[PDB]
């Protein structure tokens with residue numbers, strides 16, 4: 001398998017670090033996937049009553 | 052003969068019962084992974100008392116260019132985004148009808164929930180230039196979630 | 204045949220497993236087709252009747268000398284309605300997959316049928332597209348609230364209207380049914396460099412070829 | 422486009 005973890009980067013690109021430099025150190029192990037988990041959080045909510 | 056000197060003053064108020072109010076949510080994005088996301092495009096449901104009022108995809112005003120792991124968009128010391136519109140071109144505001152407005156004027160809250168997020172990854176092309184355009188993260192979400200074990 | 208089953212993947216690609224890793228196990232047999240079966244299901248339906256209601260008050264004073272005086276009041280209440288766009292419809296849907304392959308960029312088309320007549324055929328635009336639909340799962344996922352099929356426009360700016368007769372009969376036992384007439388979506392293939400690409404890879408180019416050369420087993 | 426309306430009125434007149 002060239003991409004062991006299933007992410008866009010191969011085993012060599014991850015081990016050798018020749019990828020994006022914002023990827024966490026953790027994710028340069030071929031077994032740990034480089035993978036973002038993004039979520040949204042609402043702060044407040046405003047109602048424009050259009051009479 | 053006769054004379055008359057009258058005065059008058061009137062006050063009126065109208066309302067549309069299909070678009071009785073406009074909704075504006077203030078949001079912030081969060082990354083808790085090991086990779087940064089470029090061109091972050093979330094999709095969110097706005098749920099009020101069982102019913103989903105609107106499913107909104109983040110358009111050009113609400114997209115975040117970079118989102119590194121363990122950080123937010125906007126950054127920590129900024130105010131949250133405004134999720135104003137439902138249109139592809141940021142020209143159409145999010146409406147709610149008369150019953151949803153009447154119950155919103157009570158203890159009822161509107162909850163938000165992220166159904167998915169879009170975004171790109173970066174790769175170095177022929178010359179040493181990082182490209183993050185055709186590099187959708189969605190082509191790998193199923194392939195990663197299927198071959199893996201999840202640890203939080 | 205290089206593609207015995209009629210799916211986008213050859214015999215060697217399926218047998219050896221060098222394809223998408225979300226493809227179900229059985230679908231890596233050359234005879235079983237890698238093929239998703241996506242359907243839509245409605246959860247509830249909301250009606251925004253768009254009347255226009257008006258209130259008004261008023262005072263008035265008056266004097267009249269040949270002597271006289273007068274102090275009148277008023278308060279009025281009106282209500283108007285359009286009969287071609289008497290209400291707006293909002294359906295809450297959720298997509299399902301019961302196939303052996305994931306669908307990327309799931310774009311369904313649904314009829315909204317009310318007492319014999321189809322009110323609208325809606326194609327899922329940018330707000331209502333699901334990026335991933337892996338087999339035996341839903342969009343949105345199990346623990347989320349359903350989508351809002353809110354608009355009928357290519358740009359998500361035009362709401363779904365119903366006229367006065369459809370609204371009047373909808374204020375009765377009449378229900379609006381939803382039915383999926385088709386679903387479109389992409390599949391993934393590894394390109395020259397090992398990047399998965401799911402853009403020109405439409406699933407509709409193989410639905411007829413698969414449905415013709417196959418036997419169906421539910 | 423169908424429209425309805427109601428209305429009341431009170432009045433007093435003193436010579």
Ligand SMILES: [Ca+2]
Pocket residue numbers: 001002003004011
């Ligand atoms: Ca390897």
Ligand SMILES: [Ca+2]
Pocket residue numbers: 204205206207214
């Ligand atoms: Ca063959």
